[PDB]
Amino acid sequence: LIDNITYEGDEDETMFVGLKEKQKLHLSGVFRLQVVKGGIVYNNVHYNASREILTFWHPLSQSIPTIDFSHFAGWLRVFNSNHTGLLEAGHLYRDVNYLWKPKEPYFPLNERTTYHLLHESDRIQSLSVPGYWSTPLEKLYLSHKNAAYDTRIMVIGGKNSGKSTFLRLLLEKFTQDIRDSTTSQEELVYLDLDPGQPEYSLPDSISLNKILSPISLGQHLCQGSNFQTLLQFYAGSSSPQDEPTSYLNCADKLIDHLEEQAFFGTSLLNLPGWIKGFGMQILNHIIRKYKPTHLLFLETANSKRHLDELTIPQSFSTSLRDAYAPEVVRVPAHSLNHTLSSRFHASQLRTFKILALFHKITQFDYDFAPLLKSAPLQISYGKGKSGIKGIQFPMEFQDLNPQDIKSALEGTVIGIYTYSGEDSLEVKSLNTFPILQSCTSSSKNFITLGLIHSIDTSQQIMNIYVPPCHTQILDKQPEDAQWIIVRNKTETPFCDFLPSPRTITWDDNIQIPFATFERRKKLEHVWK
Amino acid sequence: LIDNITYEGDEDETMFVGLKEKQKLHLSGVFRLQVVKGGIVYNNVHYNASREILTFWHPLSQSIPTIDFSHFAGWLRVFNSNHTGLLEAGHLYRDVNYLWKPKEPYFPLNERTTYHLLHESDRIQSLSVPGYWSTPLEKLYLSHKNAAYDTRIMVIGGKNSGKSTFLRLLLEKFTQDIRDSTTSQEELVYLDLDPGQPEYSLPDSISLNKILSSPISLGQHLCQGSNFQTLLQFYAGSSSPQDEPTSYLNCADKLIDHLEEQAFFGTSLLNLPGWIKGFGMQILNHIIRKYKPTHLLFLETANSKRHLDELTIPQSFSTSLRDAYAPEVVRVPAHSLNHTLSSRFHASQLRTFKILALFHKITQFDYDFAPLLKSAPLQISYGKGKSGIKGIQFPMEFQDLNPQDIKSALEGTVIGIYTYSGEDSLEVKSLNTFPILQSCTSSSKNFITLGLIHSIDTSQQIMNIYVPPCHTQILDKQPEDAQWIIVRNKTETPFCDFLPSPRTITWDDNIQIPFATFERRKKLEHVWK
Amino acid sequence: IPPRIVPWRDFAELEELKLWFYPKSKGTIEDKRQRAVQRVQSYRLKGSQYLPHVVDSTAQITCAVLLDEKEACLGVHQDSIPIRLSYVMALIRFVNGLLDPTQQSQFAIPLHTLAAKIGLPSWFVDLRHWGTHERDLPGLEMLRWAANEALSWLYDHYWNDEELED
Amino acid sequence: IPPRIVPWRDFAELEELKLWFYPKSKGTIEDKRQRAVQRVQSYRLKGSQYLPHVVDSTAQITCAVLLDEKEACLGVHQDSIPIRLSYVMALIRFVNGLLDPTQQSQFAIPLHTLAAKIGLPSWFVDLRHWGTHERDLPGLEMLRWAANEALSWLYDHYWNDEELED
Known about the structure:
The complex is a heterotetramer, with two copies of chain A and two copies of chain C. By secondary structure, chain A is α+β, with helices and mostly antiparallel strands.
C-alpha cells in the first residue's frame, strides 16, 4: 500500500493516514488519535470518535492490535505522546531499546517520533482477534447490562495463555459501554492479584484499582495513568509460592475492601496462572472468597489435565447470597501465535517496570538518567521513633547478626509502610537498627517502593531512593506517623545498581562497594 | 559319555570313579574323597594319592570346579561327608532347597547321597580356571617360598568380580605348599573384613581367624567349614560398612594390631569390600597404609576401572616397613562367572541361608534344621546390678527410644552378645528396667556370638533368647563375674525362623501371633525398596 | 495370603498410632505426637524393611512439624534453615516412596499419571525437584502448607481408608 | 570483563569469611564459625542471585555441622532424626549446584564427566540419591564424614585455588 502524505510540524509531527477501502493499520508506540470521520475497529469493537483523544500503547512485547477502518463514513491524527522521556528508556537499560520501535525497520527512524509504521516488512507478529476467541467474550457483554447486579469476573490461565489480552479487551469495551450508557456510575474496578506479571500495579505488589476518560489502551506496562489505585499491598516477590498464605491473606484483605466500600457494578481480577503446581490448592480459597460470577479458563492444549478438579471442588455452589450464580467455560487460545517471549522475556520486562518506576517525575514525564546522579532523599530512623520505627525482614531471616544488617539493606529494593492504626510499636533494637520482631503488624499501609542507597549509623539516617512521582505523598503525610521498612525479595535492576562509563565518569579514587571487577574464579557460578 | 560305577555301597552311598577316562570329573555337593592311585587336579593344583582324605564343598551358588585326572598313575573315592542335617535345609528355607542339587538333574536323584553327578545336561556351568588369571596367580606362587619373609596379600575387587574365588585359590595353593614343605609352621591367617559376602566369619561380622592346614577342605563352604579357627571377631552388624564407617575402620584397626600381638610371621590374606564405585576409594586408604600389603591386587579391569586409579596411587607408599620396603600392583580380568553372577542365588538370598544355618548348627558338623520355636531358648536375668546383662547398646540414632516401648522393639531381632573385659567402671542408664549404654563407646568389650531375642519378661527381668547350639557351652566357659552386653544392629532375622510354616509347628488356635498379621495389606502400605 | 512381618505387636497398636498422629479435637496438652514418633522410631529399630512407607512418612513429616515448634529461651543458634532443610527431605522422601517402590523397572508409567492413579494430587509430583534442584529453599510457610496438606492426604488415603487391594 | 554484583563489599570481607569458615579452633572465642553462617545468611537477603553456590553450600554444610554440635541437654542429643535430614539436604544441594546447573557447562554430558572436569570425587555423584531414592537415611557418622569431606574439598578447590577461568 502507498504511504499517505507526511505533515511535518508544527509540533508532535502529527501524521494523517488514508487507507483505500478497508486496510489493517499497523502502528507501534505510544500515540494519541482524534478520528474526525469514519469508524475505528480495534479488535472487533466500535470506536466512533468525535473530537475525543484516545491514547494508545503498543509495545512490541505483545501483539499490536491493528487499527481497522469501517463505515461510516471516511475516505489531528496519531499525534505524538505527551510522555517525554519514556523512549530514552532504551539508553539506561539496553535490553528494552526496541520495545517501542523495531530493530531495523523499512522506515527512517526519528527521535521526535514516538510512533512507527510497520508495513509487513519487519515480519513481527500483529495477529488480530480470532473469531473463535470472540464468541465466548461476546457472551459476557450480553450479560453485562441485563444482569441488574454487580458482576465479578475471574480469568484463569498460566503464562503464555493470553489472560492479560482478554482482560484488556474486557476493559476497553466495558469502558466504551459505560461511556455509552447514560447515566452509568458502575465504574469498574480492576483487582490485580498477580505479582508475576503486574498490570495496573507496582512491582511485586497487589493492587485493587479504580478504572476511569481519558481513553487508554491496551497494554501500557503499568505506565498508563488511566487508573487510580484504591489500595495496594506489597507481596515482595514475583511468585506467591514463596509466601502462599501471606499472599492469600493479602488477597483476602483486598477483596474485603470491595465489600467495605459496598461497591456494586463491574469488577475484574486476574489470578496468577498456576495451571500446574500448588495452583489447584491456591485457587480453591480465592474462588470461594471473591464469589466470581464468570469463571474463564484458557489451558486447552497446555494441557488442561492438571487444572481440572478446581471447578468441581472449589465452586461450592454460589458463595454470594445475592448473585446465586456461577459460570464454567473453556476456550482455546495460545497468544501470541509465535514465541511468547517475542524477544521480551517476562523477567526481562519485569526489570523495565521497576526501572521506569524509579525514573518517573510524574505520570506524563520521565527522566531516565541514573539515580546515582539524582539526590537520594534521606530519612532518620531513631529509637523514639520519629520517622522509621521498625524494619521488617522475611521470617527465615529473623535471626541475623546486628553487624551485617548495614550491609544487607544497602542497594536493595524495599517497601515503605505506615503504621496506620495506633498500637504498640513492638520493635527490637539491633545495632541501632530497629528490627521489627515477631512480624505480625497486620494493619499497615503500603505507600511505595524504595531503593536504599546508604545508612549512617552515627547520624541514624538512611539515604534512600523513592520514585519522584510519589513525592510529595510522603511529605503530604502527618509528622507523627510511624514508618516501617519491609525488605522482601525484590530484585534491583543491575544497570541501575552500578552505572557504566558514557553515563557516569565516577572518580578514580572512589571504590565502588558490592561490585567486583576481577574475573570470577572457577566454580563461582551462581545456581540457576 | 556313559555313566559308570554307580556303586550303592550300603550306608553313606560310597562310590568309585574311573580315573584314566578322558572325561573330566564333575561333581556337586558336600562330600569327601580319598584318591587311591593317580594324580588329581583341582583348580590347576596337584594332589598326590597318598591315601589322605579331602573334604569338598560344592554349592551351586558358586561355579563348581571340575576335578581333572593327571599322571601318574591311575586306571574310598567319593563318599558322603558327615553332615547329617545340612542337606535338609530346603525343608526349612524353600529358596536354598537347590543349593547342593540341581532342580531337574536329568539324573536319578537319591535322598541318601550328599553328592550328585552333573554332565553337560543341567543349566549350570563349570568355571575351570581362566587363563588370564593363571599367569599372575602362578607368579604369586613363586613369591611364597622365594620370599623367605612374611608375605601378606591384600586383594580388592567389587561384588561379582570374583575376589572370593581368587582368594580361595590362593588359600589352598598356600595350604598345599605348607603341607609338603618341612618344616612349614607359617599357617595362614585369613582376615575377613567383608560383612557383605563374608567367608570364614559370623553373619554381618568381621574376623581375623587362623586357617588350619588339615583336614583338607576345598573350596567354598559358606562359612560352614571346619578348616578355620576364629582368633578375633567383631560385630559390624550391617550388611555394608558404609552404615558405620569410622566404627568399621576402628573395628578394622583393632584386628590388624592383633596380628602384631601374636608376633605372627608368615603368609596372611585379606579381602576388603568391593566398593568399586562409591566411598571405597577413601576407606581402603585408611588401612592400605595400616595393613602393609606386600602384594596388592586389583580385579575390576573393564568394570570400568575409572574409579580405582587415583585413590590407590595416593594410598600406596614407597616403604611402610623396614623389612618389606616394597609394594606390588597387578590388574586382571573380572569376568566371573561367565553366566549371571546370581545363578538363582542372590547375595541377600545366601546371607539369609548363612544366618539360618548358624542358629541350627548343633555341633562341628551336625545340623538340626527343625524350626527354632521347637527348640528351647535359654534365659539370662538382666537387672539393676547386674549379673545377667549390664547394658544394652543401640546405634547412635534411636537414643530417644522411650522406656515403655523398648521391649517390643527387641523381640524377634538378631543381636550380638558381648563380654565386658576388665572394667574401670560401669556405664549404664536404666529405662523401664532396661539397662542401656547411654554414651556407647566401651571399646574393650569382645564379641562372642549372634543371638535372637524371643521374649522379655519385665517382671522377672529375664530375657529368653536363642543362641546357636554350636557356641554352647562357650558362653558357660566365661566367668560368672563377667558382664554381658546385648548389642542391637541392623541384622535381618530369617523370615522362616520368625514364623514357621503351619505344617512344621502346630499352635493352639487361640494363641495370638504377636508381630505378624494375616490381613491383606491396605492400599497403599508398601515397603519402600 | 502369606503372612507379612509388621513391627506392631497388634492391629490395636496401629489404631493407637492412628489416634496418636492425628489428635481428636484437642492438640494443646494431649498433642502426643512426639511419643508416636518415638514409637515409629522403635519400628525402624526392629526393621526398616518391615515398616510400611506410609507410616514412615507420617512419622517423618511429624518429626519435622514437631521440630519447628521451639519458642523458648535461651535463644538457639538455629537460623530457621534447619527446619527448611528438614521439610524438604520429609516431603521428598514421602512423595518418592509412593511413586518409586513396588516396583521401579525398565518400563515405568510416567510419574504424573502414577500420582493420578494412586490418588496423589499432581502438585506433589513437583516437589521432588522443587527443593533439590531449585537454587533457594522454599519459604517456611509454603513448606508448612505442604506438610499439613500431606499429613491430611495420608489420613484420608491410608490411615482412615480401608481399601485392601494394593 | 563485565562487572558482577556480589553481596560482599570487597575482598577483605570475603577473605575473613574463609578464615571464619575454617578457623582450626575447636571452641571458645577463636571459633567464629557460627558468625560465618550468620553472615552468609545476610548475603541471602540481598541475593540470592549474586551469591555463588560454592559459598551458599559452604554455608549450608557448615550450618548443619554446627547443628549437630549441641551438647547441653537440648537440640540433637535428644533426637537425631533432624541431623540426618539436614546433612542430606546440605550434601544434595552442594552436589546439585555444581554437577547439574546445565547452564555454565555443556548439557547432556553425563554427570561423572562433569565431576571429572571440575575435579569432584566420583562418589559425590552417588550422593544425589543417598537419602532421596533409598528407604532409610544414611548413617549419622557416614553423613558427618561426608560433610567434612565436602567442606575440605570446597576449601581445597575453591577457597584456595588461583584459577580464574570458569
